[PDB]
Amino acid sequence: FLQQYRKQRMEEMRQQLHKGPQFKQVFEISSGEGFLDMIDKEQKSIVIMVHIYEDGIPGTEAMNGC
Amino acid sequence: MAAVKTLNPKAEVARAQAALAVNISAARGLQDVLRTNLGPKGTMKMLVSGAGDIKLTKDGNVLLHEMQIQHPTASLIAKVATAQDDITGDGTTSNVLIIGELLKQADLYISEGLHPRIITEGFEAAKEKALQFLEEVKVSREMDRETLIDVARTSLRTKVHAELADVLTEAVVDSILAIKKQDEPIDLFMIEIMEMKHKSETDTSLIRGLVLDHGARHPDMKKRVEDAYILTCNVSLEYEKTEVNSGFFYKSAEEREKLVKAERKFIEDRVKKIIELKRKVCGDSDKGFVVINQKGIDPFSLDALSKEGIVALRRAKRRNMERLTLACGGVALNSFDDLSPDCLGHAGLVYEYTLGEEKFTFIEKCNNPRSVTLLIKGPNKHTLTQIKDAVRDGLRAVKNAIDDGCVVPGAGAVEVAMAEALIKHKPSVKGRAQLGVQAFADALLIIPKVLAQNSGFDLQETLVKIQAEHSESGQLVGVDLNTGEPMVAAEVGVWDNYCVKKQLLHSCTVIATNILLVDEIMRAGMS
Amino acid sequence: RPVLVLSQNTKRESGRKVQSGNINAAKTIADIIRTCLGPKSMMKMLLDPMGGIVMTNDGNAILREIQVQHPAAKSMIEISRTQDEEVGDGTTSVIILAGEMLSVAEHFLEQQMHPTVVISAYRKALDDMISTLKKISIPVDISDSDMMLNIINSSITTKAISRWSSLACNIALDAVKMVQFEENGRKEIDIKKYARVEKIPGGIIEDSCVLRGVMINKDVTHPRMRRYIKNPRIVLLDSSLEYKKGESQTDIEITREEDFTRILQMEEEYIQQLCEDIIQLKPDVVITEKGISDLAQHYLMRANITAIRRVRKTDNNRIARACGARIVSRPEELREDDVGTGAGLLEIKKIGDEYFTFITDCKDPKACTILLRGASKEILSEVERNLQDAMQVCRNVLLDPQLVPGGGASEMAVAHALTEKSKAMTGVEQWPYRAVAQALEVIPRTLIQNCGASTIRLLTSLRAKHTQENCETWGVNGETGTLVDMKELGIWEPLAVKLQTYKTAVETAVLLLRIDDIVSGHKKKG
Amino acid sequence: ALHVPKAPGFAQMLKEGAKHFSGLEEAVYRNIQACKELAQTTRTAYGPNGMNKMVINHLEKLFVTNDAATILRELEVQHPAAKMIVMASHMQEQEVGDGTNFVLVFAGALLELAEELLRIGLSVSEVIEGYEIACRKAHEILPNLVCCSAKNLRDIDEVSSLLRTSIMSKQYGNEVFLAKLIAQACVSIFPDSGHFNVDNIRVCKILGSGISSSSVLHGMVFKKETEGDVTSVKDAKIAVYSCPFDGMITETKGTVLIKTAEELMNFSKGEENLMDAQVKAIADTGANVVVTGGKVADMALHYANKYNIMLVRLNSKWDLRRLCKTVGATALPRLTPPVLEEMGHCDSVYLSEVGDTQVVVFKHEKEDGAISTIVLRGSTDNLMDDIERAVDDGVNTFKVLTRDKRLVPGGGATEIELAKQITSYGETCPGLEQYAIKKFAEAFEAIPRALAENSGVKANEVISKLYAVHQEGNKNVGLDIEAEVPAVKDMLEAGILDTYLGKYWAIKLATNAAVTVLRVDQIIMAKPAGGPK
Ligand SMILES: Nc1ncnc2c1ncn2[C@@H]1O[C@H](COP(=O)(O)OP(=O)(O)O)[C@@H](O)[C@H]1O
């Protein structure tokens, strides 16, 4: 039943491998100029992912945990 | 205020009595919702998903999954019920009810200044005594068809309508007896639960064979073969490409024709092997070949097979390999290097059924199949889902009964007897754990209470009638759901799985003990 | 235009306020888990930001699940993690001790004593505590299984698994004993890699056991293979058993009619050759970390060989240790020594609705799996954490056979010894020495507080008892709130655990007492 | 004291957008009201005097019809109970083909009377048991109400008379002509073998000339054109090919490797010569029509035009299979010339224009064949769609007649007789289930009531007349549509008969849906969230 993601469960258990010091948190941007001068700077080789949210609305905490 | 809030300002903390109150309230809410599920007299619930899918059910675990709950303690109870369903397949509603009643009875004494540790100690002592009594009360018995029928009825009647339960009992018991080997563990994968959506709910039945959800892909294939040889194979009869980037080079159209003709020789060799085997096996028109292939078959091979009067199916399920090798009796082949007549299955009837755009193939009249299929019929999707859940519960119950010859009388009789045994054992417990033992007994008493309430009778009056009858007579009298009078569960035919009761006791006691000892709930992962 | 020397977001805090804040943060971190110490500890519920629930009274898990902003709290959490990794026990004890020492240091810091004097006094006291702890220790015969079981019991009476104590102790002792290995003159335990804990929700806890082998969540590739082999000869592999592309670009060019069929037949013949090379050793089970082709399955099946594919590397190493095999990545180089004989039974059985593969009759196995059956996932997670604590304590005892009285006896004895030693200093630094000496009483005090008895009366009685000569083993019965002699109660802890706890707490206090200026807000500049 | 907090327990643990309904008033009565509303929406389109409804779906596509199943499927019903009743109606449509409106009306009436019974004091279990008993009684009674049988399906007149009733409810004005068309189409199909295939009847909708100009063609019509220059064949020799009409190519990858000048010069000549040889080999078998399921190569088209070969390209494989069935050819996978047993034959193939659309016709002279098609004309697309729906209803009625040949009087005669007999039985039954049995009997009155309401007369007078007449014993008497005053007449002479199997299945499905709706006691709806489709 490969259509039902046999490995999904096992990927979930060994995704719980924080191991090292704490688990940190996603970077929070509180200024538009901060966003602009962090995206403009930094090496372009690696990918930058940004999450847009508003407090209270559902569909946010799950994304942050992911 | 709290230390966590001092470190993490936006942290939610419930401390001391607050955490215990929160947990007990959540358990009480879950129990209040799931009370009406218990017993054949329980009420159906309609569950509508976000997309609008409709599901009618009475299963406790199914209801828990579809309940729109966002509570931690409810999540823990749901995980416990999920484990209970996974291992035994029954008792989820009883699991939740017993957990909630245990927590409520424990709170009844904790609110009087008692420490939860003493209540947990009493719970452990009562669990030990109750397990001893359950071992003392079970009815060890070699199980013929009658006892299995009774157990399957006791489950399916609680799950579905009475007439549907009557049909499903024969279906499930016959299927289990068909696939059961002597002194061997029962493999439930060998019973295929296929659902079709055209007939009424009472037309579901058992086929001593196999049913496939796909049919022949060539319009010229035979639609019904009387005497069939089954060739179960896992060989890709469709076209394949070289692993090493082959490519073709030619200088003229004739060379292109030659290369095109010569590119299918590899597959044509396998097809020729199959054709030669069929010709050698049967030279007349009496018999026939059905070729079930786990991998695809290209149209050229389909045409080549059809010209020889061979019906073939492609893209079958992996479990169907074992199902066919056990039902028809052949050998699943991953290659045709050395194929012999003795590796061919047999089937006394193979025919194809069309339903709308869906296509089905029946493999019937097997000699002595070790793998049967349970065909589910109904006019609605939700009806099919309900019947599927009920059949799962019945199959699990029958398998559990077969596993150990002991069976426990139902209708709450064993709960009442265990409650009286615990009450009598209470003086032997030293200290204030007698309160915990009493709470455990009262919590165990919830099942007859809920059964009587669902049946519509008075709760306390029925319970005291049952208890008085059991005390004066010593028999295992349960709650009759038509009159409310005491009734002997064993004689009537209300049976319960011993493994289900043992798992209920163990899991309920463990989770209640763990919850009672929780004094703080924290969510401090943010910021 | 606001021209500044430093950036706008840079904030600098300095003075006695910084020391007070650090000490208060450490105190509050201690107060987080102050109630989770002793046999009468109460468990806590942690709501994981990923959606899970963690129910435990282990200090390290609770402190790990908490996200904090004050960097002193981060230091304390790192202290908890270090103590957990080094010895596996005493997390709550070390956190509480660090908090108490920082409190008694803040005492003097409020006066006009420089922190360096406190640091020197703390280091002297640490040396004296190490000396006294070594002095009051006793040796242990590791051969006596009863003493080892008693030690593990003392280690696990404070956890939820305490209700099943003999079972857990036997499981941990057997696992640790059979994972013990020695090769090339080097002795190792390696609880992390081998001695796997596999938890399957359902069943009952008393059904949990440690297998004389390895169990994996895998099934046979083809149903026709045997699911029950009496005395298997196991062969392990890494390389796939399927035709694969070469490393270099190897495009072909077909101009003849029979080259396509020849290519496909050559692929089939290569697979057959690999299978024949495997078969030449006449094994019964073939385990591969990677895929096994259907044709390979057929060729193995023709030789009556059970094949299992797609196994994790850690599981394959565990199987190799259990059955005494060697993983071979090239079948043509398979040797007789590589064939794994020593497994006494292989059996694939269905648990619940999912197949499991057992290799569970090995003679002299150097790896094992622990099968946990329980109510649900969270209960089994807590049980696994308790088992980890038990195994860590057992390995600590095996490495160092020294024991120290527990239940507050060690702390009180060390405090009395340091108090007596401090009587002959006559220096400005004797006061912090005495203060950090009596700061060790927080462990008996916490035990009494969690028990529920009166703290002041019991603690005074315990101090009076310890002022006598031969009373180093007098501690607090954490269940009844009475003074007992722990050579009678039987609570003992490894000397390594106590030494690590004391060292880590003292150096946490030292590290947090050297700070008097906090600057924050600057970029990483990476 | 200004706000009422949520009750502790399940009420507080509920999600944000979720809704919970429990008890009689909150759940069962509301479900009954929703089902009654759905039945009310569909009620007015029942019987010959039913009214078409312009229904516009979310895709802004207009549907005008009185088919209950189509109306229900074109409405995004939101209430789960009405969803269940719609599922029952669709199941009835799939199983039989006609009777969806009967299912919906009967379910609505049953649920309304169940609500009344619950209000007067009965329990849900008692009502469900009473309905099950009454449904079993009705299924027992139904075989005794059969008036006549089909007794012949190869005849045109008898089949037309049988099919007139089914397609009289839809397109009431002109039912004889449509009955004749569908009768001819079904009689051409349905060979001596008893098996009848509904899919063998094709419908082609060509606009322009009014529905009275429709006809039946023994063959197929494709709204396409001919690729080649030939547009008419009189002794058709179709040679169907499932492969593209082009030289085949390698499946992995083919590159023309040229190493000398002569190969480069001769490649195109050789390829063209090979194409010509293949096409001439095809033509030498006497084939003059070629039907291909793939693309047509330019050189292949030229060489086919050279040898006077008609080219027809079918885009869909289903059309290719249907043409093979209706001609007698085998879908070849290569350009090899067809052998005699694979050789397709037809009486005439030509290119014709009907209205303003060019069509290719495969016409059989004989009144027989595997597949027959109905060329539908009309002045509007929606009108032709309604005629197609009526044709589907008639064909399904013919299929049911093939399966079961028994017929019962229509126009409310069967419903009134069933109600009378079930009421008579319910009096003899003691206990509390007699009320449920009597209400089940009364629920049958919704059919004659709907017919009378749609016809424009007083329903009460019609129902009283029907009860009286059935009281003497004329059990084949229903209301007269062609009358401005409430009146009744015998349906056997009028030939207003509906299939017994349809009535049986419709009653079973309606009762099952009503009972299943009644069984529900609690509803836990989730937040609708998204769900684009
Ligand atoms: N016919 C009957 N008469 C009396 N008691 C019954 C009858 N059938 C079932 N029971 C009792 O009612 C209970 C039904 O439980 P059930 O609703 O199946 O909960 P779960 O689904 O959690 O097992 C069983 O414990 C059984 O003992």
Ligand SMILES: Nc1ncnc2c1ncn2[C@@H]1O[C@H](COP(=O)(O)OP(=O)(O)O)[C@@H](O)[C@H]1O
């Ligand atoms: N039965 C007991 N009575 C008194 N003290 C005990 C008992 N069991 C353990 N202890 C003491 O409790 C301490 C262990 O506490 P624990 O909860 O394990 O903290 P940690 O998890 O940080 O090790 C040890 O110092 C031990 O001496």
Ligand SMILES: Nc1ncnc2c1ncn2[C@@H]1O[C@H](COP(=O)(O)OP(=O)(O)O)[C@@H](O)[C@H]1O
């Ligand atoms: N000429 C007629 N006179 C009286 N009643 C008729 C006539 N033709 C059809 N009917 C009735 O109309 C009903 C059919 O209604 P219809 O709109 O087809 O709904 P459904 O599609 O659900 O059957 C049948 O029960 C039949 O008795």
Ligand SMILES: [Mg+2]
């Ligand atoms: Mg049950």
Ligand SMILES: [Mg+2]
């Ligand atoms: Mg510890």
Ligand SMILES: [Mg+2]
């Ligand atoms: Mg109709």
